[PDB]
Design a binder for this molecule. Structure first.
Ligand SMILES: Cc1cccc(Cc2n[nH]c3cc(O)c(C(=O)N4CC[C@H](O)C4)cc23)c1
Lengths: 266, 342
């Protein structure tokens, strides 16, 4: 529970809640190579890769979530060509796991996990084996920590969501779906643009609508800017429409080929 | 790296601040231990002439203990907890450097000065205690335990804008599964009887020990040196000062993993004329003083009956004359020597 009630004076809030136009402005350099649709599809793909890596290593959802935010922060500022996202994904999982003290991920286990997960679950995207070794992970970790300005503590919607569903008295009915919808929000930019409690409230609202639960009084009893919640609700509804229309298994090899490549040395 | 973009690599290399370019520290080591290497440092450009503490973290790369110390220090902000100013990541040798403001003094050296004088303080003692409680209360409210509290880790600032302000330092940031099992003078009895996790109450016991030592100039549970949590002579010293606890004083003592060992080695009768009252009388502290009644609440044997840091801060001791001051030295000149180089 370290720093649990400190969000408003946290580095998450003060530095890493970004402006949407600044995010879009920095994205234009990669948008010379990829369309907007293709870039969103890449974000979805690497979220799934990180999820699969964390599941292989048996890490709790919060640790996986933290690793996903690290990845998003890096490529919010820099181009996909700067460091290989195939290398960056396992590095983010490795770093996130070390912010915890209940268990350790060893070096051989990390490399074995990256090798195995990419061949058994992502062979449609990657015909060759994971070509990086531990020294490449350790070097990439230094760049990641520097870029993030050593900001390692991250807040997520899971803790507030838990408090809200307990307050409703609807844990058994609503929590499993609301939790699942929170997982799906990491396929978008939402974690860079809104505080976690607002994301949780949007996910709980969409869950209530899917399950046909009347909760309009409960949402009225809160003191929150409902306009920003509605903005978040609309990104969730759109996410599931892109999900329907997207086949990552058929498309990602071609999308990955269009990514800008690194300049070699002299 | 070959697969990293070259323009990106050289740009960052050109811009990256190196610790050796910004600071002068060679030959200025002031500390060496399990934490790593600490140096007194000056800024190489003449922008300000302040002293800085540079900590080179023990080992290479970013270990689990290194990762957590950076993570938590990056967030924590309070006047009585030492404040991280900057992190340098040295790519050539894979070393991590942390920059803090420089504290000239600490309670280990301050207490040793008074203990050495064999051939202000009462106002100072209260003010020190209040700031240590304030600092630990801030960490505790954020669910951050110190886990290694002792006089060497209670820094006090010297001449400058923060004169006589306590700075808590060297928090035990990494402990596997929050476990003690993975010189014992400041360790709560539950740890010595095999407690499996660190708690807020364990930190509070340590503050009680520090408070006794500030009042007497002697470590209250001083003991001879010498993997397992059970340490016989340290427990013997605790009972010699405190007395042996009755069943009613610590009902859950039976649940501690080393309770049967305690019963095997110790007998109630041995400590039948021992108590904190009698000990503190011998060291010239009165048992009807507000200072003493607070000390006893801090040094409670059963951890669930131990006072919290917030409740200790509300104690009438801190309303009794003299009141605690922001500068623990209270405007008076500092007689304590400056720390020497290595
Ligand atoms: C050896 C030594 C002892 C006391 C104080 C100073 C000087 C200083 N100033 N600022 C600091 C910040 C710090 O994190 C540490 C630090 O890392 N420590 C580890 C042991 C003790 O807990 C101090 C030191 C200083 C040097």
């Amino acid at each position: 529970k370290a720093m649990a009630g400190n969000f408003w004076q946290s580095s998450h809030y003060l530095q890493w809640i970004l402006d949407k136009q600044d995010l879009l402005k920095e994205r234009q350099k990669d948008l010379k190579f990829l369309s907007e649709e293709e870039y969103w599809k890449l974000q979805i793909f690497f979220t799934n890769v990180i999820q699969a890596l964390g599941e292989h290593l048996k890490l709790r959802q919060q640790v996986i979530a933290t690793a996903t935010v690290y990845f998003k922060r890096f490529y919010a500022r820099y181009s996909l060509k700067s460091i290989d996202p195939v290398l960056m994904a396992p590095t983010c999982v490795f770093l996130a796991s070390k912010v915890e003290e209940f268990g350790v991920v060893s070096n051989t286990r990390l490399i074995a996990a990256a090798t195995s997960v990419l061949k058994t679950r992502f062979s449609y995207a990657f015909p060759k084996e994971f070509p990086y070794r531990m020294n490449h992970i350790l070097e990439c970790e230094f760049y990641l920590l520097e870029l993030m300005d050593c900001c390692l503590i991250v807040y997520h919607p899971y803790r507030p969501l838990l408090q809200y569903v307990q307050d409703m008295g609807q844990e058994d009915m609503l929590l499993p779906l609301a939790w699942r919808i929170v997982n799906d929000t990491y396929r978008t930019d939402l974690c860079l643009l809104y505080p976690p409690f607002m994301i949780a409230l949007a996910c709980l609202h969409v869950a209530c609508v899917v399950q046909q639960k009347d909760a309009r009084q409960w949402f009225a009893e809160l003191s929150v800017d409902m306009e920003k919640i509605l903005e978040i609700i609309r990104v969730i509804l759109k996410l599931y429409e892109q999900w329907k229309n997207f086949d990552e298994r058929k498309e990602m090899a071609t999308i990955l080929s269009k990514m800008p490549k690194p300049k070699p040395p002299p | 790296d070959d697969k990293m973009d070259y323009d990106f690599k050289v740009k960052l290399s050109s811009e990256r601040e190196r610790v050796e370019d910004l600071f002068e520290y060679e030959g200025c080591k002031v500390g060496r231990g399990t934490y790593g290497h600490v140096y007194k440092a000056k800024r190489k450009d003449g922008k300000d002439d302040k002293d800085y503490a540079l900590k080179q973290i023990e080992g290479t790369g970013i270990s689990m203990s290194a990762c957590r110390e950076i993570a938590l220090l990056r967030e924590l902000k309070h006047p009585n907890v030492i404040s991280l100013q900057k992190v340098f990541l040295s790519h050539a040798d894979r070393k991590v450097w942390l920059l803090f403001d420089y504290a000239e003094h600490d309670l280990w050296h301050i207490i040793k000065f008074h203990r050495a004088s064999k051939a202000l303080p009462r106002g100072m003692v209260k003010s020190l205690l209040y700031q240590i409680l304030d600092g630990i209360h801030y960490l505790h409210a954020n669910w951050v335990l110190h886990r290694d509290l002792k006089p060497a880790n209670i820094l006090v600032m010297g001449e400058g804008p923060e004169r006589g302000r306590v700075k808590i330092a060297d928090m035990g940031f990494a402990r596997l599964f929050n476990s003690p099992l993975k010189t014992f003078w400041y360790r709560a009895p539950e740890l010595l009887l095999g407690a499996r996790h660190y708690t807020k109450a364990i930190d509070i016991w340590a503050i009680g020990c520090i408070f006794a030592e500030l009042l007497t100039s002697e470590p209250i549970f001083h003991c001879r040196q010498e993997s397992n949590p059970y340490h016989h002579d340290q427990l013997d010293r605790i009972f010699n000062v405190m007395g042996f606890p009755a069943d009613k004083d610590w009902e859950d003592i039976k649940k501690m993993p080393e309770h049967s060992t305690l019963m095997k080695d110790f007998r109630r009768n041995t400590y039948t004329n021992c108590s904190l009252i009698k000990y503190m009388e011998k060291h010239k502290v009165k048992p009807d003083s507000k200072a003493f009644h607070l000390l006893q609440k801090l040094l409670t044997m059963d951890p669930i009956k131990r006072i919290t840091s917030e409740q200790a801060m509300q104690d009438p001791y801190f309303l009794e004359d003299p009141l605690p001051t922001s500068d623990v030295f209270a405007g008076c000149q500092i007689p304590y020597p400056k720390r020497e180089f290595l």
